[PDB]
């Protein structure tokens, strides 16, 4: 797309921990919903993470209930189970978002950023006009007309 420079990768836990700033930003979530809808597939994981984020952000101000009253034997384990279950749902949504972004890029002839893999037509990470002459993680030298991934016309 318009962003073609080198990029670093971050664990999904970091983006999930980022709340209603990037991961749960309503505009970005609406864009993801539009991407799913224009492809005509259900947005079940997106809606699950949306309701999870809404519930979390609504009560983030409130103080936690007294932990002494809660039973460490069972209540703490139940809370950890629920937190892990929510985190797994958000992981699934994150993976789905990345997969569908790659797929839409491939369909629309959109050249991704450097070292970005688009299954079906790159399969090893497209790199073009990078600061390093060689392909990162592959050590393959790169030509100046970097790579024509798609057909010329249109």
């Amino acid at each position: 797309n318009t962003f073609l420079t080198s990029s670093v990768a971050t664990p999904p836990i970091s983006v999930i921990r980022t709340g209603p700033k990037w991961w749960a930003h309503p505009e970005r979530m609406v864009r993801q919903k539009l991407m799913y809808f224009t492809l005509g597939v259900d947005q079940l994981p997106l809606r699950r993470t949306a309701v999870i984020q809404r519930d979390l952000q609504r009560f983030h101000m409130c103080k936690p209930p007294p932990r002494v009253g809660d039973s460490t034997g069972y209540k703490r384990s139940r809370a950890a189970q629920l937190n892990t279950w929510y985190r797994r749902i958000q992981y699934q949504e994150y993976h789905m978002q990345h997969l569908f972004t790659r797929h839409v890029w491939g369909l629309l002839r959109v050249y991704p950023g450097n070292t970005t893999k688009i299954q079906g037509k790159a399969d090893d990470g497209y790199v073009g006009y990078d600061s390093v002459p060689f392909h990162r993680y592959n050590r393959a030298p790169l030509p100046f007309p970097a790579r024509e991934l798609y057909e010329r016309r249109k």
Binding site: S6, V8, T10, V15
Partner: protein, 160 residues
């Protein structure tokens, strides 16, 4: 109102290209005008590096002047007219008055007694009626008369 940005992002530690973070002088910002301020590559501050590309004031003024140029071009694209000097005798009654200069009076109105309250300085007159004054010697048939739809006519839109 406006939705875009007008102020240059502040100088901090090096911004890595990741989620919700962009390099400070990436080609996306300001359309492509961060190219002027971009100091490509890792820079050793001891010897390499131009001062003005790091000075927060000069880059801010550059962003301001770029935004001013953008505002000027977007404003001028709205112009579907030109200003012509008329000898004050052939203008209609709504123009035969003491029009104050810009920023020297309250926004005036064209003949408020005629139930017209629009700004007088933003009135635009078509040539279909002004051809007589603009081109008296030419005559002939230039800019044929503008057909005006009859409001009081039973057409399809009137549920005829």
């Amino acid at each position: 109102v406006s939705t875009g940005e007008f102020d240059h992002p502040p100088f901090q530690f090096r911004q890595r290209h990741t989620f919700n973070t962009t390099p400070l002088h990436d080609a996306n910002r300001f359309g492509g005008r961060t190219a002027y301020l971009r100091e490509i590559g890792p820079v050793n501050i001891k010897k390499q590096g131009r001062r003005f590309k790091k000075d927060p004031r000069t880059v801010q003024f550059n962003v301001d002047v770029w935004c001013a140029q953008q505002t000027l071009r977007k404003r001028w694209k709205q112009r579907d007219w030109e200003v012509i000097e008329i000898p004050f005798r052939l203008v209609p009654r709504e123009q035969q008055r003491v029009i104050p200069e810009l920023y020297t009076d309250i926004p005036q109105m064209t003949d408020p007694a005629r139930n017209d309250f629009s700004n007088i300085r933003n009135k635009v007159y078509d040539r279909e009626e002004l051809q007589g004054v603009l081109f008296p010697a030419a005559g002939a048939m230039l800019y044929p008369p503008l057909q005006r739809v009859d409001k009081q006519a039973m057409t399809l839109d009137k549920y005829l």
